[PDB]
Structure formats: structure tokens, C-alpha cells
Amino acid sequence: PVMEKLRMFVAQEPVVAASCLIGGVGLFLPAVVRPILDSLEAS
Amino acid sequence: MILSVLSSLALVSGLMVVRAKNPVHSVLFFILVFCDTSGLLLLLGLDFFAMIFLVVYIGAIAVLFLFVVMMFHIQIAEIHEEVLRYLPVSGIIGLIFWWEMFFILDNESIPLLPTQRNTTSLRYTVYAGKVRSWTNLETLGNLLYTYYFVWFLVSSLILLVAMIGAIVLTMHRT
Amino acid sequence: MASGWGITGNKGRCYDFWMDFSECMSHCREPKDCTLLREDYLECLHHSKEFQRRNRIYKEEQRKL
Amino acid sequence: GNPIPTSAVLTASAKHIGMRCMPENVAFLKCKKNDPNPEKCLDKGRDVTRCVLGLLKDLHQKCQKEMDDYVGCMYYYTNEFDLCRKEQEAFEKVCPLK
Amino acid sequence: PYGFWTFERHNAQLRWDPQISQVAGRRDPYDDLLE
Amino acid sequence: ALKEEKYAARRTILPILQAEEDERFVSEWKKYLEYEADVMKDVPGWKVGENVYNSGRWMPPATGELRPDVW
Amino acid sequence: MMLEFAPIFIYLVISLLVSLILLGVPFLFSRFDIRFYLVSILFLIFDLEVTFFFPWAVSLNKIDLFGFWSMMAFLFILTIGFLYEWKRGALDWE
Amino acid sequence: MDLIKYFTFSMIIFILGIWGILLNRRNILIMLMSIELMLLAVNLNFLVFSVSLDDMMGQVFALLVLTVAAAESAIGLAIFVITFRVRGTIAVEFINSIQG
Amino acid sequence: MNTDITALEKAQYPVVDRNPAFTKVVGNFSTLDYLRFSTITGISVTVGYLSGIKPGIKGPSMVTGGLIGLMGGFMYAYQNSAGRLMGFFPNDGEVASYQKR
Amino acid sequence: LVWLEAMLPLGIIGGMLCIMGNSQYYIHKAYHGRPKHIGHDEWDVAMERRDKKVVEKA
Amino acid sequence: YIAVPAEILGIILPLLLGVAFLVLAERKVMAFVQRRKGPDVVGSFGLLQPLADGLKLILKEPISPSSANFFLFRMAPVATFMLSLVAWAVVPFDYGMVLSDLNIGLLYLFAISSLGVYGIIIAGRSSNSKYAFLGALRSAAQMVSYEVSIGLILITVLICVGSCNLSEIVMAQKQIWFGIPLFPVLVMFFISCLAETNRAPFDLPEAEAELVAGYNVEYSSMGFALFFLGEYANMILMSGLCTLFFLGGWLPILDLPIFKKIPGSIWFSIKVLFFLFLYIWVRAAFPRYRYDQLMGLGWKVFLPLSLAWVVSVSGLLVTFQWLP
Question: What's domain G5-88's architecture?
């Protein structure tokens, strides 16, 4: 049941969770969004 | 002249690194040798390396040396020895290395003797290179992460080994 | 200066000489065929012969004085 | 009569010099690309110099006050365009780039 | 052998450097003025 | 855009500045060549203004200062 | 240009003179703690990380996506090191 | 004469490292610092040559050698700490058991 | 970033596609490729389980071994598929599908 | 209104900072005849060195 | 170059006066929060109190304990004082108002920050007191720990600007101040500056009542004064960096002709004054952390957040091609 384990992990360690989220958005945007924009520009 | 002043400061400070009785003083004279090196780099126009020698050698490496040496409280008896007897061997080794290496460039890089004529008037200026000039920082950053990125990553592996080995060798968890 | 990357962000001072020497050596099966280009590259690197000649001029000036 | 071609004058007139002396500039740059020797381009250089000096004289005669003000501002601010907008606009109103 | 330098494995720079000959950081300065 | 404006301005006045510098260097090199011919007169085998490069391609005279442009 | 560093040197000399005047006018009238070694090591590693970021941050507009991802791989290796240090209690001072 | 003067600056630092090895047979911490002086001299060589040749490869390598020097110092001092912790002293007479 | 796929040693088989895309190489996975993938993954899961018994972590060790095996088997299958598409490995089926589509 | 007493040492610090800027700005301008230019690069240095000749030799 | 000393003095002397009066302003604002008056007898509104304390300090006899490190003991406060002074050569107060227009000024500031630890370390060791030495080691550790976060935040700003020139960093905030999108970065930067200047709630050297003797416990007379003056000059500097990096330096709040009537040095001074008020307001508001707690905060909270913000800002700017 790994859904409240994430909830507890956020409750115990909010700074780690926030760092992972902020950095994860920073990694997600160039990985996923940027090729979408490059493709949308090609057509 | 200026290069002579910096060379003399570095020479005295290095002698004091290798000859000070107290190792704390040795680490402090080492900081002076790094400051002098930073000055030389500023003369060569490499201001990024001049700042990084301050940040890394003095700001981080010398600090680690100082922390370790200070907490060790070395006693002068455990490390003392008279060095008069090494003057001959130092003389021969240093003289061989001097005569051979202080003059290694002389055959290949012959110095231009300064004449009593203004040679500055023959400096040719090419303005095309000066329209958008690059700093040392961006010139290095243009190469580190693209054309030579593998060596960058191998250096990261070297740093990882340092972190692991530091923990494994010294950690005693409370 | 064989890489091409200059320290101010342009082609290195001695890259063209290097490339001439390399292109000569790529098809000349004897290294002696590219000796002139090789010493051109090394002259660019160290300015040995130029400075030697200018020192000759300076020496002659000192001798005639 | 003819303005001194200082960095202030040349920079303040650079837009006109680009819109007007494009061919001589291009020829000079092309032959510089072919041969870096200064002696082997003195002719193409003289065509650039005559272009620019003729255009500079034209600007002074065609608009003296507004060019003076612009050049003075550009010298004062060491050729920073953002600090000299009013004088650039005034100078361009009277001597259009066209 | 006779002229190892002559072999194609030994001429990698001569074929790769032209492909980066237009890259910022290694151009002839006049290239920006004409292009 | 601001930086591009300033770089445009520098590009258009580039040719006249380079032509001025070329004239200056040519005149100075002529003067130095006369000086060299004068001093090196009576020395057999000398060739005034000989190109040390076998290819003969023109290079600016070397200065013997490591980084003179930055100061 | 390196011209702008000379005022820093003259500034240093003047600061020295002021220091000595202030300090001189009154002369007229055995227990090794490994946790300091460990913090030194951590600081050194991240000092080198800041050092490698300086050229990257100014060069991002030219290196584009390749440079971004090579720096990300670098960070990933060093952050694995950081997680190792964290789990081993090198970040705890109690 | 610029290149020779910078070169001799770096060369004197290298020789000082060699002498510091030669002169500190009871002081192994100073030996580690002498090795760091040699490494600094080499880095200077690379930077000076990079300038003299108008080539960037000397600067790339100087930065990487910086990383290596930092790693070497961290590991070296860790080994020094565990050597001292085991023996209680840094005297060279307590680190000479292995021989023959 | 300028690139060049050209290899030192030329492909000895019909070059179906010089630089096949990632998804194209994945879609080129054959029965033998999946057999290699599955064998590597299963061996790795098994080694993880067996080596995890003594420390008492056979399940987590199984997951770790399975991850190592998944990455290694996928890399091996990709290697083979891309080599076939590029003509470096015998690629009869690739050529038969290419000459028809 | 007693709290204005606290605003005096702060205003004196702010004035000290304004002096640290403006006094050095006006001394450089008097010595060079124009304000200091931010971003003096190799081009500007070369322009000044050439302008010396173009002015003095005119 | 003959007028360069005039410029340097016009920077250094008013800075020493501004520090003298920062001490006064700290004593006044803390007093008012505590319903007290603060120094108001020595001069009108207490305005001559700095002069009196400085003259008292220079008239005090120096002590100079019988240590084997006579020279280093006196040199350590000189070292820290010099380091605090020399950072101002690259600080721009307004457009064109700066002593040295360094293209590498950001890295230079980081290097000075990194050098600041040696004065404290050396003072602690040279004092021949185990209390001073232990306090010094803890303070040095705290400073280097928070320098990591300071440096990673510097990298975030550099990514936005694309240049290490401090004037360029200011002028890149004409569209918008960097403290608006990066407000969490500004918060973490202000906290990391409190911990780097050894200020409350991170002031270990002040916790003598807590059985923690500070690195400057043995110092008297003017060496003690030089340590104190270096620390306070560092607080004005860190308030100036907060202003330059995130509050747009000398720029006005709004690009409007009414706001452009007052000069840029006034804007810069007012923002610096806001940050100095907050340094004092925090001292007056909260208790202090223990050493282990603030060390945990440094490594486990501020390093990860700073690193994550570097990644997020660089990735967002690379994705949409908003890079400088």
C-alpha cells in the first residue's frame, strides 16, 4: 500500500519532499516539455 | 620586475612551508604561496583561475589542512630534525634540476632581448576579434560541458570516490 | 595550438599551420616531405627563429656602438 | 570643417555608415578574409576611407547642431546608446537613415 | 609500417575538425563580419 | 537586442578603423625596414625583412610579451 | 581587460594602513573531533560543485541541451555521494 | 623574456616541493604539503602554456587537475587521521613495521 | 552539437537504417531479443534472491538484482536490434521487412 | 513619535552609503572629464588608445 | 591613478562611520522594541555614543597574553577587518558609481566570503585557551557550511543574468526584480547571510551565557574592536548583496518619471536600510539555535533547497529559451 507511505514521507520530511518536487519540475520541463515545443515548432 | 617581486615572495613563502618548525605555520605560509600564484594568474589575464585558486586552494583545501593540523596538536619533538647535514645532497639535486630545468625552454623558446628602439609601434591590432570578446569564464564554459564532457564526468567519479573513502575510513557514528 | 580553440574565443593563432602540416602528413609517406610545414608550426608555437634573428640585429647594433 | 573621426563621431554615425557604405565595407572585409597582410589591402581601405569621410562631411553640412549634440552625448557616455536616445531621435529626425 | 600516419584511423582530426569549423569558439574572426 | 545594437554599430565602423591601422602599420614597418637595412649593412648574407616562415604567409611581428592585450 | 584589478590592490594597501593605525595607536599611550574533518570534506566537494557551475551558468545560452544534461549527470553523481553521506550520519552533529 | 620568467616561477615551486620531500624525513605532513606544491607548479605550467600557445586545452586540464588535487588531499588527510588514531603519534618510527 | 555516427569499421551487411531512432530500434525487437532480455532479467532476479538470504533481505535483494538485470538486458537487446538495423550484425529479417515496406 | 530617534542612526548610515557612491563618482569624473563607463572592454580600450592619436595628432 | 586613493578613502571612511552608526541603530531599535530608550545621553539623541566608545576603546591598555603566537594573535583581527573592507571595491551604488567594474565580481565576492574564515580560526588557535579554540572551530564550521548555500544561490542569480558583472546583474532587473519570481531564494539567501555573519539566531560567539566562549574572548582594546567592526561591516555588505541580487540594486520600484526623480543611490541606500532593520528585528524577535541544530539546518535544509532551485531555474529557462 504505497500511497500513505508517501504521505508519511511528506509529513516527516517536508524539505526533502519540496526539494524533490522543485528539482523534479526542473528536470521534467527540458525532458518532456522541450521536445514537445521543438516538435510543435517543426510543423 | 613585478614578476621578480612575486617570484621572490613565492620563493620565501615556499621555503617557509618546507622549513617551518610548526606545521600550523607551514599551512599558513602555503596560503601565502597560493595568494602569490593568484597574482601571477591575474598578470596572465586568467581572472577565473585567479579567483578559483583563492576559492578552492585557500578557501577549501587549506582550511581542511588547517583543521586537521590544528586538532592534531603535533609536538615539536616528534617531527624535529637538524637539516644542516642535507645541504650537500640538496645542493647536488637542486643544482642538477636547476641547470637542467630552469633552462629547458631556452633552446626552444629563445627570449627576445629588449632593444633601445620602440617596438611597441609594430604591434598590429586586428579589430575584428574585439567586436564581441569572450571572458576566460565563458571561453572555458564553451568547452567543458560539450566537446570534453566525458572528462568532466570522470572528475565527478573521482570526487565521489573521495566522499566514499572519507566516510569509510574515518566515520565513527555516535 | 593543435586543437583550434583559441583562448579568446576564436581560431588559435597556430591552428592553420597545424592543419597544413597534418594534411601534408596524411598522404606523404615520408615525414621529410613535410619538414617545412612542421617547422612553420613549431615556429608559430615558439617564435624561435624570429627572435634569434632580431637578437642578431640587436647584437650588431651593440657591436657598431 | 571636416569633423575629427573620433570614436564618438564614428559610433554615432555608425548606422548611416552601415546603410551607405555597405559595398566598400563588404569588399574590404572580403579581401581581409582572403589576405590578412595589411599591404595587400591598402586600395580597398582607401575606398572605405573615402566613403566614410564623404558621408561624415555630408552629415555635418546637412545637420550640424543635432549631430553635434549626439556626438557630444556619445562622447560623454562613452558610446552607450541607451543614455543618448533623445539626441539619437533628434539627429535621426533631421538626417534620416533612409 | 611505412607511414602509419597515412592510415585513415590516424586522420580522425582532418575529417572531424571541418565539421566543427563553424562553431563559436574556433572561427576565424572575419567570418562573423561577412556572415 | 541592446547588445545586438551595440555590436551592429561596432561592425559598420570596423573597416575604416582597420584601414587606418593597416596604413599605420605599413608606414611603421617601412621605417623599421629602413632601420634594419641601415644597422645590418656591411653584414654579409643578411636579407632585410626575411620571412622566417617557409610558407611565406604573413604573420604580425611577435612581441615577446605573453598577454599584452589584457593590460 | 585586467585594468580594473589595480584599484583593488591600492584599496588593499590602504586598508592595511588603516588596520595598522587603529591597532597601533593604543601602543602609544589534545582532542581530535572527526566531525570537523567530515564537514571540511563536504565543503570541499560542494566548493568544487559551485566552481564547475560558474562557467556552466554563464555558458548555458551556447551549450543548450547537451550542456544542460551533462551538468545534470554530474550533479546526479555528486548527489548520490551526498545521499550516501546523509544515510551514514555524516550530516548529524548530535 | 616573459615566458621564461613565468616558467621559472613554476619551476621554483616544483623544486621547493622536491626539497621539502628531501628535508622532512621526520615530518610526513610536510611531505604531503610538498606534493601539493609540486601539483600547484604543474597547474601553473599548464595555464602559462595555454596562454603562450593560444590554446584552450591547458585550461581544461588545469581545472580537472584541480579536482584531482582536492580529492588527493581529502583522502591523504583521512589516511593520516586513521594512522594517528591507531598509533597515538605521527612520528615516523611508528610507521616502519613493514620491511624487508 | 555536431554529431557523426560513422563507425571505424564499415557495416558488413545491408544497411537498413544508418541512425535508427530509439523507438524504431525498440520496435525492431525480435523473439531472440526478448529471449535474451528475459534470460538476463531472470538470472539477475535469481542471483538477487539467493545472495539476499543470509543478510535476511531476499526480497529487496531480488528487486535490486532485477533492476540491474532489467537495465542490462534492455541494453543488450537494444545493442543487437540497432546493430541489425545498421548492418553490423546479420540482419536477414530486417532486410526482408525493409524490402517489403 | 519617540521612535524617530531610532530613524536617525539609520538615516546616517544611508547617507554614509550615498557618500560612498557619489563622492567616488564625482572624483573619477573630474579626473577623466566624463563619468566612468560600465563595461569597458577591449574595444573601448582600443578606441581610447586610437582616439588619443586622432585627437593629439590633429 | 593619482586620484584613486581619494576614491578609496571616500569609500572606506564613510563605511567606518556607517558601521559606527549601525551599532548605535542596533542599540536604539532593540531598546524601542523592549520599551526602553537606548543611548540618548552621550550627545543629542545619543548620536555621539559611537565616538565615545571608539575613543574609550583606543584609550584602553592592550593585554597581549604570554602566548607563543604573539604575531598571529594580533594579525587575526587585522585579517578579518581587511577582508570585510576589501569587498566594497566591487559594490556598485548607482550606474557608474563603483571603484572596480570587475567582470568576475560575483566570483570575487564568493572568494572573499571564503577567506573570511581564517581570522576566526587563527584567533581561536592563537589565544592558548581551549574554550576559545573550540568556539572558533564551531564558528568556522558554521561559516563554511552556509557558504555552500550562499554559493549555490549565487549560481541561480548568475543563471538568470548570464554575467558575473555586478552592474550587469543589477541592470538585468530592469524588467522585473529577481526577488519577485525567486522570493524563496531571497528568503534562503537572507537566512544564509545571518548564519554567515554569525548573527542571531545563529550567533554562537554571543552565547557566552550558554557555556560557549567565543573566538574573541581573549581580545581586548582595539583587536576586539577590529573583530566587531569587521562583523558589522559584513552585515551592511550582505544587506547590499540582498539588495543588488534581488531588489534591483539602484533601480526604482516602478519605471515611472515620479520614481526616477530621486537618484539611484537613494534607492540603493533605502533597500540596504530595510535589510539592516530586519537583521536587528530578527535579533530582537527569536531565541537562538544550538550548534548541532543550525549545522543540521545548513546541510539538510539549505543545501538541498539551493541545489533544487538551481536545477529548476536552469531547466525552466532552457526549456522555453529565456536564457540571457
Answer: Up-down Bundle (1.20)
